[PDB]
Every structure is written in structure tokens, then in C-alpha cells.
Amino acid sequence: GLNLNTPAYVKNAKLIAWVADMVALCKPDTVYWCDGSDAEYQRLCQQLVDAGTFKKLNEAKRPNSYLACSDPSDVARVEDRTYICSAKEENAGPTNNWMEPSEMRATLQPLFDGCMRGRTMYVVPFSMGPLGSPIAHIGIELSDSPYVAVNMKIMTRMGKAVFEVLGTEGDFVPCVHTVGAPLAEGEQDVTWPCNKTKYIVHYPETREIWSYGSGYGGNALLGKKCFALRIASNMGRDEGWLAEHMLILGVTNPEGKKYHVAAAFPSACGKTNFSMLVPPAGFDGWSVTTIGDDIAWIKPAADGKLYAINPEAGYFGVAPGTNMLTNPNCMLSVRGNTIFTNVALTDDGDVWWEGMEQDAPGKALPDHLIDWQGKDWTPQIAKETGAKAAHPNSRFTVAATNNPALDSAWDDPKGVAIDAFIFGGRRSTTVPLVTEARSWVEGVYMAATMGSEVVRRDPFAMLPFMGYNMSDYFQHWLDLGKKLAASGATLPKIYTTNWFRKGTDGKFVWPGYGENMRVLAWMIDRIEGKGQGEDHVTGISPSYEDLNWTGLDFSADQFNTVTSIDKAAWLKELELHAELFKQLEHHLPKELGETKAEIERRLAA
Ligand SMILES: [Mn+2]
């Protein structure tokens, strides 16, 4: 009908009929199709300013940037409200919340019925992956949040170009989102509409994503987690590829040899820092470049290699902790053209977040700020009330092309061949600085059992993002490796890393940040077959002499403190693995049991 305002370039009848069904359900006042243009982005930003959702930052301090502050009830992903509604509960598994699909549809129907009354529905077309490419997938998100529209513009390839790829019959992932705050005639809107009742629902068989009540981050920017991980992991299982919670980086040595690694880190462990790593002193001629900092789509090719693409177009990164010491490439990235969410406002109209004082003379805190809740903030107020100036989950949104270390192949549809996988974690004890798995299966075991500090397990860093049963996902990784090795291929190395072993004084021994290059360089030597290492109960680890210490005062005893293996600690660690496996017993692959038994055998030898 005429009420869809369908542009002429939309030729896809199934898509129009679907938009019509959701407009019939959600009943927005008007329907607007986002063309993705720069002018439209500025218009929507101005609408957000007019509503009070955005404040324009000072154009001298932070050009063409905006600050949004959210309702305190709507500040993060809500995992207890996130559902995998597969036909069978066993295909959701113990790491996912399940509900019978017909029961969830009956639950969501009255909530979405009229949810957009009084609001504009934004039709947000987007490609995950480079446009028109053989490995990209198209999504359409219907949303009543202009905040969602402008952030999706930065985070994805958004707008009119999508429809030339879809053509008249192409498929798309259907996404529906509402803040769940319908407006009556003459009602004054709030600056951050949301609902205390929240649902983030995935129907894997139909690829549907339904989001109700949150306008924040991973709940509402449906391309990032709901599509590019949860739905995408299901597609990869059926089609022979991988959707992973991994950065992708390129590392080039002084001879121009270039390697790519994919690395999964749990929350507060350093994917953005590592993906933008700056080589320290002693690594002249080396360069590290960013393909992606969060999501990897990885497909084996006929040539026996695993090719990864970053399906996103920008960064939606955690702000606190970012400074010129931990991550100068990220700091340079957010110099302008950035949307900041829930960070603090300085007196000169700039932004601030915990950790930025590391760049200030004397590392001094600012005298005064307006915090993410609009309150006066001072160091003394922070001391008295405990309030952080920026919310811990505060964010920047910025285009990938703002990154000075952006890899030249970041949008190459052919992807990059992965030479190694890295699985991080934060462990005060037990886990060495770096360990190389002796085999693919033993690497999958490492990824399956990774944890972060008590110690919480987060297999493959996918605990909140697996689109199906975690144990079947383990099996997918094992089968994929077997099939690759069967074609004669050389499987990528797998490493576990741990930056956070504590010394006898309780401090972190490993300096981390740019010095992580020294561990990465050892991996490179191993990939080339020229690196040495010590074999131990769980794998191979470098000796002190195997790393390049040029430019860092770091002693053998410090290195052995973070890298040496202790049988007593690993006996206790395997007990914790046993607890994890009981929480995951259904369809747990036998190969993981064989790996645990082999570690136990080496511990007793
Ligand atoms: Mn992430």
C-alpha cells in the first residue's frame, strides 16, 4: 500500500510484504526508508539533538561528534532477557535461554502490537560484509529509534545500495526492534525511550530477530550480536563456516611477510587494544593493522586455508580504559565523527572517561565533569558516592576508516587467510603467558575451557552469543578442522594467552599493551617453524630466550613467573573443567574428554 512509502529502488516483493506485515503489527505513525546517505545521517542526528537524546560536542575539541546518555535501566545487554527460540530446546542448549517458539510468538505479539504508535518506523537496510560480495548477508532492521538508525549507519554498510544486491528475489535476515514506548497524541517523549520489560529473541529456523524494550547497544543494534553472531553461527553450522567473537589483525615483519591472526578475548581482556596493537621498541619494521575488532566470519576455501572477513563497518567499543598509552590508534580513531554513549562531559564540551587521566600531566583527574547521569562529578564526589564519570559499559561508535592502523584489506570480500587463533583470558594463576596447542583438538579444548576472573568460564568467548547448543558448536570446530586437514591443509596454530598472571606482591607481572607484540612475534616464529619452545603438560610455551626483549627491561624470573607450569595448579584447574563439562554434558564431544584424560596422564607421569 501507499502507507509504506516504498522507494522506487526497492524491487523485492517478499521484502515489501514483510515490511507491510510488521507495519500492520507495530502500527508506526509513519514509515521512513533509510537510504544511508550522509545528509540523512546528519538529519537524524539533528532530530536526536532536537529530542535531547544527543548533545553536539564542541566542534573544536571533537568535530562532528555527539554524546548520548541513556536511561539508567538501559545500559547494557540483558542476557536474562535474551532467547534462542529453536524448535527443540536441545538446540538452544545450557548456555542459552529457551522458550517454545509458538509460546514466545504469543508472548511477543501483544507487546509489538501498536508498539510504534506515535513514532516513525525506520527501515534500515544493511549488508554484513562488503556489499554485493559472495560472503556477505543482507539484513533489514525495522526500528522506531533514530539512535539505532544513525549507529547502524556507522556500524554496517547501510542504505540504498543494499537493494541493488537484493534484487527482486534475494533473501534477507528479518529484524524488528522497538523501544516499547508508544506515544499518545500530544505526549512529551523522554530523551531515552525504553521499557522495563525487555525481550531479545532469535528464531534460528527463520532467522528472525525480535527486540523489545531496549534501545541500547547489543540489544538494539541487531546487526552486531544478534545477527553477526547468534543467527550467523547457526548459518555457519549448516553451511560449513564460522561466526566467531574474534578480532582479526594483520602483522607484517620487517621482511614484508604478512600474517593474520584471529583472537577471542572475554570482556575486560583486550580485543580492541590487541587488534590495534602498536609495536613497541625493538620492533622497527613491524606493523600491526586492524581488519576487525569484534566479529569474524571464517570460511574454509578450496586451497585449504581459512579466510576471515569482518562483517562490520565500524567499531562499537567500550570507552573506559582507552587512552594514548593503552590504545593510541583507538584514541586517534575517536578524534571526531564519533557517537559517544554514557561517557562524561568536560567543562569545555569534550568527553571524558575513566582512564583518560593517564594522558594528563601528573595523571591528574579533571576537577569537574558532568557524569553520564547528568550529575556534577568531582574526584571528591567520586570518593564520597563511588560514582564513575562514565558508565562502565559506555561506548564510542566510529567508522573503521577513522582507524590509522586500518588494514588495507579490511573490506576485501576475499578475506584474509588465518595463520593462528588466539584465545585469551584473565587468570591470576595457573595459565601461562602463552601456550601453543600441540594439535587442533587440543586447541579446541583450550578454547572450550577458557576463563576469566571468581573465575568464570566463557567458551570461545561465545557464552552470551552462541546461536545453538554449545556442545554442537564445539563439534562444528572439531569437524571443520578434520575436514580441512583431510584436504591436506595446514591447520592454523591455536594459542592461549594470559596477560594477567600476578606476582608474589599481587601486581600484574606482564606489562601488556604494546609489549604483547613480543608474544605475537613468538607465534610468528612458530608459524614459520623457526620458533623454539618447551613442551609441558598442556602444550608448548616459549622459554625466556625465545622472545625478543630488545627495548624492555623484563627479567628471566619475571618471565618464568608468568609462563611456568605448575602441576598442582593444573590438577585444580582440571577439576574446574570437570564442573564446566557437567554444566555442558549434553552432546559434549568425546575428543574433549580424550584431551582432558591426556592432560591428566601427563600430570601424573
Ligand atoms: Mn564483543
Author numbering: 8 to 460, 471 to 622
From the paper:
Analysis of these crystals found that there was an open holo form (P212121), an open bound (C2221), and a bound form which could be observed in either the open or closed conformation (P212121).
Ω‐loops are non‐regular secondary structure elements that are characterized by a narrow beginning and ending (β‐sheet structure) with an extended medial region resembling the shape of the Greek letter omega.
